[PDB]
């Protein structure tokens, strides 16, 4: 109306499978230049230590001794008359909501934390909580590495309650290298402003 032309409608192309993967690359590239140039808070700056690439292999070779039963083994365990035969078996827990119950009740002895998680708020409180209960702790890179033990895809946290008698001396070797990187310098980790 009023002597003005009719409205015009433009067209759009649907994105191809190469064009979608191409555009997501320039999104993650812009963020990596952004977050480094500003100053990040100290609670995130503590998550840069990975302890080594090599020292991870000694801890994961310990936990693979204690794997839980599979699905098909669980049904054959119930085919027997008495399900509980012999002593209690030593296992390895793998859940986030279950491990923070263990540390609050002081049952654990060694905790591994994956720094790979996105969103990042879920594990910000973990190294401080172990400090109040005097628990040694360590940080590994990827949560895929922790799922390789429990036959799962991704796993955030992982901890043991006890170990057998033969691997006692093998356990004390790990804690010494783990403590001098984190717990002996914990009071410095709160003060370091990443910039």
């Amino acid at each position: 109306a009023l002597g003005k032309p009719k409205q015009k409608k433009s067209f759009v192309p649907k994105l191809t499978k190469d064009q979608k993967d191409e555009k997501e690359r320039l999104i993650t590239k812009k963020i990596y230049k952004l977050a480094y140039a500003i100053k990040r808070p100290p609670a995130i700056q503590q998550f840069k230590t990975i302890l080594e690439s090599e020292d991870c292999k000694r801890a994961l070779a310990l936990f693979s001794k204690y794997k839980p039963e599979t699905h098909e083994e669980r049904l054959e365990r119930l085919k027997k008359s008495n399900p509980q035969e012999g002593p209690k078996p030593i296992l390895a827990k793998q859940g986030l909501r279950h491990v923070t119950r263990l540390i609050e009740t002081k049952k654990a002895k060694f905790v591994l934390v994956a720094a790979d998680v996105n969103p990042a708020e879920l594990v910000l409180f973990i190294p401080t909580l172990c400090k109040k209960m005097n628990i040694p702790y360590a940080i590994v890179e990827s949560q895929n590495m922790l799922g390789s033990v429990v036959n799962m895809k991704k796993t955030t946290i992982l901890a043991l309650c006890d170990v057998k008698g033969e691997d006692k001396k093998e356990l004390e070797e790990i804690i010494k290298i783990s403590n001098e990187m984190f717990s002996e310098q914990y009071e410095q980790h709160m003060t370091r402003w990443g910039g």
Binding site: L2, G3, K4, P5
Partner: protein, 232 residues
């Protein structure tokens, strides 16, 4: 009242706007050589265009004054200065005539497009790398250097010599240039169509100088004048 003539003309330009060529020249890193191919004429404008050929590619450009078919010209940042060549602005001495000036680098051209109108250079300032140009409108404008431009006066001469002695001559001019012709004076109109209209005799009754403070549909007459009348 009703919507007047001025607002109704602008919305008629949105239903069918006017079309022209906008000729621009390319950018090349070093000095090359090109040949003039032919000369043509467009519908709206009076100045003839020229088709040059750089690296087996044909572009369009405004023809300078002395140009014939088959001549050779050079384009580059450091070409020699002569008639029809296109060089950087810093090379030309003070007092010559240029006729296509880009505002910034690697642009087509902005200033001096029509036929018969040229600009002059007045100085060079080695501090801050700037030169002052003399626009055809008569105002001194300061230009940054390193823009490139073309040397010479444009063609088509002085068209405004002989008058439209007939009414039929002005009919074909405004029709090709897409303007409204003929025009009716606003005093002859009835007071619905225009503010000045109506009355028992043909007169205005209001001061014709109108400020720029007022809104857009109230602007008519001599808008925002600093002076009115013959000087002497």
């Amino acid at each position: 009242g009703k919507v007047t003539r001025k607002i109704r003309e602008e919305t008629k330009k949105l239903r069918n706007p006017r079309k022209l060529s906008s000729p621009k020249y390319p950018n090349f890193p070093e000095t090359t050589q090109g040949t003039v191919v032919d000369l043509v004429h467009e519908r709206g404008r009076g100045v003839p265009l020229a088709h040059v050929k750089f690296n087996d590619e044909i572009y369009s450009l405004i023809a300078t004054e002395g140009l014939y078919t088959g001549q050779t010209i050079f384009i580059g940042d450091n070409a020699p200065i002569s008639i029809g060549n296109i060089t950087k602005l810093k090379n030309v001495p003070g007092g010559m005539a240029v006729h296509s000036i880009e505002y910034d680098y690697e642009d087509g051209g902005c200033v001096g497009m029509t036929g018969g109108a040229y600009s002059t250079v007045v100085t060079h300032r080695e501090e801050t790398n700037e030169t002052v140009l003399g626009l055809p409108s008569g105002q001194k404008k300061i230009f940054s250097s390193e823009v490139r431009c073309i040397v010479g006066v444009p063609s088509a001469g002085g068209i405004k010599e002989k008058p439209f002695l007939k009414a039929s001559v002005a009919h074909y001019f405004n029709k090709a240039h897409c303007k409204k012709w003929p025009r009716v004076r606003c005093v002859a109109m009835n007071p619905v169509d225009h503010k000045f209209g109506g009355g028992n005799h043909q007169h205005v009754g209001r001061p014709t100088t109108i400020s720029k403070r007022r809104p857009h549909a109230q602007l008519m007459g001599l808008i925002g004048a600093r002076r009115t009348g013959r000087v002497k």
